[PDB]
Design a protein around this ligand. Structure first.
Ligand SMILES: [Ca+2]
Ligand SMILES: [Ca+2]
Length: 312
């Protein structure tokens, strides 16, 4: 398996458990610091990073009734410049640029208590696919599916329903949506960290997934595995293999990685392309920092880059 060693450039530092890299509609960059604590309790933060200086600004420190959040993954909305943030303690949050936020759900479409989420992915239809490796959201005692199979997958639809689409995952983590060339969502990829597997489903419609399959295999016997992921314009899936020092590159058909990217650190967490460029911003937990490197091509357009009223 060929390995490339592109130059990694420092972006920002000292961000506890750096995760959820994301760009909004104005090209602003954001990162989440899920591991920030205040007296042993969760006090996670959502930060805006100045790309010119690397200076950090905490725009939101979500807390619902005294229970601080553990924000872990982000996606930018299209019809409004707002962030949908997966929180391991609070579920799904919608965060504005001014720093205000709203907690989307305490319960799913079935009246079942919501589970703490880790990452999410918008499909071109506007539906949000979310991974939920944690147990029930606050006030319930914090638990996570690293050992037991209680991790779930949700789909927050356009009509506002929080639908649980699957369960029994051992820490579902990264998530991405594969689209047909005409923009139709047709395949969902879900990372299951400890088991070193990438799972796939055929998306038949909003919140409708079928034919669960072990799509790809993550290298290594190290503690960790597939964390964050994202597609490039040619539909190759780059996955952060936490603990391996590499970001794995999968072809459209999955299986074994067709290339690996060596990072000058052991714990790559999440990654995100900068709109209209080959630049991939990567968060890592060895030093708890953010980096950037040039990939072989542009990233797949995120939902926020598409046009609602576009003709073509
Ligand atoms: Ca993650
Ligand atoms: Ca991403």
């Amino acid at each position: 398996i060929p390995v490339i060693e592109p130059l990694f450039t420092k972006v920002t530092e000292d961000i506890p458990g750096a995760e959820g890299p994301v760009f909004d509609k104005n090209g602003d960059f954001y990162i989440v610091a899920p591991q920030v604590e205040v007296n042993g309790k969760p006090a996670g933060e959502i930060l805006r990073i100045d790309l010119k200086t690397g200076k950090k600004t905490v725009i939101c420190k979500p807390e619902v009734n005294g229970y601080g959040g553990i924000p872990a993954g982000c996606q930018c909305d299209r019809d409004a410049n707002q962030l949908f943030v997966a929180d391991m303690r609070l579920g799904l949050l919608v965060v504005q640029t001014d720093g205000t936020f709203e907690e989307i759900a305490k319960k799913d479409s079935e009246g079942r208590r919501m589970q703490g989420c880790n990452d999410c992915a918008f499909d071109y239809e506007g539906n949000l696919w979310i991974t939920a490796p944690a147990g029930e959201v606050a006030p319930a005692d914090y638990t996570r599916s690293m050992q037991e199979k209680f991790g779930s997958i949700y789909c927050f639809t356009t009509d506002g329903q929080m639908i649980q689409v699957d369960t029994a995952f051992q820490f579902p983590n990264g998530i991405a949506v594969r689209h047909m060339n005409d923009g139709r969502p047709y395949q969902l990829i879900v990372a299951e960290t400890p088991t070193k597997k990438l799972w796939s489903y055929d998306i038949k419609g909003p919140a409708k997934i079928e034919n669960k399959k072990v799509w790809g295999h993550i290298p290594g016997t190290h503690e960790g595995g597939a964390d964050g992921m994202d597609f490039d314009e040619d539909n190759n899936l780059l996955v952060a293999n936490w603990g391996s020092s590499h970001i794995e590159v999968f072809g459209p058909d999955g299986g074994q990685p067709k290339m690996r990217i060596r990072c000058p650190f052991e714990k790559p967490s999440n990654l995100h392309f900068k709109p209209q460029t080959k630049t991939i911003f990567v968060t890592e937990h060895e030093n708890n920092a953010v980096w950037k490197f040039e990939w072989q091509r542009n990233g797949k357009k995120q939902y926020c880059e598409t046009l609602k009223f576009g003709i073509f």
